[PDB]
Amino acid sequence: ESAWGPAATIAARQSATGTKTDTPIQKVPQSISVVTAEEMALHQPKSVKEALSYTPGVSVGTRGASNTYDHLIIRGFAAEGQSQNNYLNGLKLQGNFYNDAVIDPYMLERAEIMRGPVSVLYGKSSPGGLLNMVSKRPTTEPLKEVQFKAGTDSLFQTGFDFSDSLDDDGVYSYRLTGLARSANAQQKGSEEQRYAIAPAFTWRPDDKTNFTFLSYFQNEPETGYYGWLPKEGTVEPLPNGKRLPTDFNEGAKNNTYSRNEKMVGYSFDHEFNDTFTVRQNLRFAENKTSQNSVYGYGVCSDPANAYSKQCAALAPADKGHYLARKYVVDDEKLQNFSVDTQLQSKFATGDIDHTLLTGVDFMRMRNDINAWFGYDDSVPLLNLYNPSSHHHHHHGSSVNTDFDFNAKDPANSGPYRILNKQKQTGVYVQDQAQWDKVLVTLGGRYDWADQESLNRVAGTTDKRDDKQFTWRGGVNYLFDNGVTPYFSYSESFEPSSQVGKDGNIFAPSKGKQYEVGVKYVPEDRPIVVTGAVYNLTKTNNLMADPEGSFFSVEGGEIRARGVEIEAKAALSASVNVVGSYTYTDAEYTTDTTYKGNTPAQVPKHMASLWADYTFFDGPLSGLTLGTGGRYTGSSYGDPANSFKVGSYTVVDALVRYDLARVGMAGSNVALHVNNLFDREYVASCFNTYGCFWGAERQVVATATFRF
Numbered sequence: 290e291s292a293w294g295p296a297a298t299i300a301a302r303q304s305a306t307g308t309k310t311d312t313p314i315q316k317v318p319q320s321i322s323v324v325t326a327e328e329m330a331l332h333q334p335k336s337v338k339e340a341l342s343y344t345p346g347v348s349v350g351t352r353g354a355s356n357t358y359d360h361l362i363i364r365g366f367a368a369e370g371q372s373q374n375n376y377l378n379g380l381k382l383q384g385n386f387y388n389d390a391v392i393d394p395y396m397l398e399r400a401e402i403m404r405g406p407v408s409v410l411y412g413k414s415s416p417g418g419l420l421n422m423v424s425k426r427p428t429t430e431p432l433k434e435v436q437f438k439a440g441t442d443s444l445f446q447t448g449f450d451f452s453d454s455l456d457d458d459g460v461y462s463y464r465l466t467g468l469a470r471s472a473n474a475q476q477k478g479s480e481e482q483r484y485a486i487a488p489a490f491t492w493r494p495d496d497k498t499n500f501t502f503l504s505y506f507q508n509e510p511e512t513g514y515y516g517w518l519p520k521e522g523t524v525e526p527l528p529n530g531k532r533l534p535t536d537f538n539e540g541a542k543n544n545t546y547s548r549n550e551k552m553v554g555y556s557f558d559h560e561f562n563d564t565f566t567v568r569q570n571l572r573f574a575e576n577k578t579s580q581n582s583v584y585g586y587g588v589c590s591d592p593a594n595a596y597s598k599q600c601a602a603l604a605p606a607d608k609g610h611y612l613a614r615k616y617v618v619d620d621e622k623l624q625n626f627s628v629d630t631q632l633q634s635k636f637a638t639g640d641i642d643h644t645l646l647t648g649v650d651f652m653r654m655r656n657d658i659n660a661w662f663g664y665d666d667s668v669p670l671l672n673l674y675n676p677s678s679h680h681h682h683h684h685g686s687s688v689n690t691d692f693d694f695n696a697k698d699p700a701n702s703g704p705y706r707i708l709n710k711q712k713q714t715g716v717y718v719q720d721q722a723q724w725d726k727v728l729v730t731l732g733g734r735y736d737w738a739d740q741e742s743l744n745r746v747a748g749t750t751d752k753r754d755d756k757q758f759t760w761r762g763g764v765n766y767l768f769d770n771g772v773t774p775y776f777s778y779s780e781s782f783e784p785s786s787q788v789g790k791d792g793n794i795f796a797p798s799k800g801k802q803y804e805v806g807v808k809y810v811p812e813d814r815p816i817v818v819t820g821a822v823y824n825l826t827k828t829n830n831l832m833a834d835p836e837g838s839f840f841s842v843e844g845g846e847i848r849a850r851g852v853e854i855e856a857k858a859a860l861s862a863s864v865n866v867v868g869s870y871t872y873t874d875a876e877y878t879t880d881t882t883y884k885g886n887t888p889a890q891v892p893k894h895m896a897s898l899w900a901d902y903t904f905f906d907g908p909l910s911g912l913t914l915g916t917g918g919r920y921t922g923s924s925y926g927d928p929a930n931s932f933k934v935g936s937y938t939v940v941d942a943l944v945r946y947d948l949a950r951v952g953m954a955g956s957n958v959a960l961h962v963n964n965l966f967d968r969e970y971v972a973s974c975f976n977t978y979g980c981f982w983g984a985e986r987q988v989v990a991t992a993t994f995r996f
């Protein structure tokens with residue numbers, strides 16, 4: 290019983306993000322996780338970020354209390370600059386600079402994460418993995434849902450989800466999902482707002498043809514907090530021995546952040562006969578973003594402010610409890626088009642059944658940037674001596690003062706105007722030959738990644754075309770009792786947008802991974818358990834120039850090797866459980882400035898476990914009680930490994946009551962509380978001047994009704 294029970298467990302056994310063909314998870318020679326709509330509806334995650342919380346190999350709350358982006362550090366790696374490596378419907382949501390798009394989980398059918406190299410099917414990519422969200426689609430049966438949310442910090446949400454067939458044979462059906470949300474962010478003076486509508490339409494002329502129109506529109510007046518805090522006053526105590534309170538805000542009173550998303554496309558598939566099927570995926574999007582932001586830049590005594598006049602103008606002991614600040618003014622617009630066409634050839638060679646995949650992937654991205662950035666001494670200073678049992682106890686924090694984002698002094702600030710172009714075209718081939726219990730996957734892909742940046746201010750143009758090749762091979766020995774052992778080799782590549790000492794675009798970095806493991810996907814039991822160990826290596830990483838030159842040099846190499854185990858299974862008819870453990874060994878293997886160091890923000894040990902319980906007996910029938918905990922190990926807060934952010938464990942709880950016992954079947958009411966013990970933690974730090982307070986205990990009531 291209960292939607293998220295074995296019904297989800299099993300549905301989650303299938304996926305395509307691993308092989309670009311509908312394969313059962315144990316037949317995929319690579320690490321992959323799946324979270325369902327029922328699952329997401331139970332936990333009510335703020336973003337896809339949380340939705341993946343009980344998955345191994347993923348730091349998902351790195352930025353802490355911020356929700357602006359959906360950045361994930363998978364297996365200790367991320368894309369250059371920390372740009373999202375997020376996919377939607379098999380097509381990438383390409384972004385640039387501060388222009389990345391996000392998707393509300395209320396518009397998703399499910400989310401999936403694939404670990405390690407994946408270029409063999411998607412082209413240029415961060416060695417570590419990629420997230421792939423699936424848009425909600427028109428349903429077979431009717432759906433009339435309205436949802437109401439009320440929570441802390443003045444969180445108020447209201448949305449709907451409607452799906453129906455236009456004819457009685459289902460050849461014509463739609464779906465319309467929309468939500469309105471507004472709330473105050475953890476940090477004083479920050480707000481969050483969002484309006485999203487997803488129009489979808491399906492067309493099934495017959496039973497071997499499907500064309501579904503997928504669109505999304507989202508408007509966000511205010512994005513929320515995305516600032517930086519010094520390790521001094523967060524991880525470590527201030528000279529006065531106190532700390533900045535979790536709701537502290539160091540930006541202007543007039544800081545502003547907005548994102549605009551518009552996209553249309555479709556998912557198509559046609560089964561010609563018994564040996565041929567073809568599917569194409571296309572999407573076009575125009576997204577915009579803007580901000581007027583004052584961010585922190587460490588305390589005056591931080592090396593980063595060695596050249597700060599305002600900073601030196603203070604007594605040597607004050608430099609340690611004064612915060613330096615810089616700013617930015619950004620305006621961006623980008624259009625992104627994508628099409629992936631694939632032909633599936635099903636056949637065999639006597640006991641050698643084949644599944645030949647061959648297709649072409651294409652994409653182009655254009656992002657126009659017009660920003661302005663304040664450097665040293667471009668904005669005031671803040672005397673962090675404001676912890677006190679006042680701003681902690683009483684109104685945790687006092688908003689700061691305004692700030693002139695106009696009249697940009699040529700002395701302390703400057704303009705930034707860039708136009709980036711990106712184009713990628715790849716062709717791939719992959720066969721899945723199963724020889725009765727001996728499934729073997731082997732494929733390849735050739736990519737054409739071409740980039741071109743125009744510096745409107747310098748009147749300069751940097752360009753580079755790359756030509757790469759990646760292949761993957763693996764074998765799964767599917768037993769018949771459940772236990773499915775596997776292993777595989779995999780490659781990945783990622784072009785560089787950086788320019789070197791010579792004035793050229795660095796060569797692409799590459800991903801090399803060896804992984805072995807076993808998967809338990811028994812068919813007679815609603816349970817699934819996995820475990821794997823891997824050795825993933827990225828090469829030609831950009832490192833400091835051997836002789837300090839302001840420019841970087843390639844050659845750097847990093848290695849990440851670890852163990853991941855995931856487990857999901859129904860223990861009774863009312864008790865479900867989910868959990869995983871992650872052991873990550875990330876290390877600098879070749880770097881001028883570092884070496885033997887572990888990159889920042891990546892803990893060595895990671896773990897999480899969750900379980901729920903529903904009643905089908907007494908007056909407490911239909912009552913669901915669930916709870917879980919997420920543990921984050923210690924991590925370094927900078928490449929230099931000069932200090933360390935400590936480990937933490939947050940607990941979440943929910944009480945759901947199946948309102949069906951009042952006649953309203955399919956409707957229910959829930960209460961969710963995050964960080965129950967309202968712990969206080971520093972999520973992570975990317976450096977000494979870039980740390981983030983974790984999320985402070987939240988409480989949300991959710992009334993969802995089905996007609």
Ligand SMILES: CO[C@H]1/C=C/O[C@@]2(C)OC3=C(C2=O)C2C(O)=C(N4CCOCC4)C(=C(O)C2C(O)=C3C)NC(=O)/C(C)=C\C=C\[C@H](C)[C@H](O)[C@@H](C)[C@@H](O)[C@@H](C)[C@H](OC(=O)COC(=O)CC2=CN(C)C=CC2)[C@@H]1C
Binds near residue numbers: 371388663664705976
């Ligand atoms: C490869 O280096 C990347 C590391 C990422 O990771 C993080 C977590 O680590 C750092 C930062 C990160 O975000 C920094 C950061 O953000 C700073 N500002 C950037 C601009 O806006 C305000 C904040 C920042 C730093 O000093 C930062 C810093 O020291 C560290 C270690 N500003 C300044 O000193 C000031 C006062 C002005 C600079 C102006 C120009 C415009 C920039 O020089 C630009 C040409 C380019 O150099 C960067 C954008 C570069 O980006 C790319 O090359 C690809 O672009 C992206 O992917 C950008 C992007 C970053 N994030 C986190 C999210 C989305 C997009 C970053 C440095």
Ligand SMILES: CCCCCCCCCC[N+](C)(C)[O-]
Binds near residue numbers: 630651
């Ligand atoms: C009909 C589906 C195939 C779409 C092919 C898209 C063509 C993109 C142009 C390729 N190239 C970059 C080499 O000019």
Ligand SMILES: [Mg+2]
Binds near residue numbers: 754755756757797
């Ligand atoms: Mg090349």
Ligand code: NA
Binds near residue numbers: 765
């Ligand atoms: Na295989």
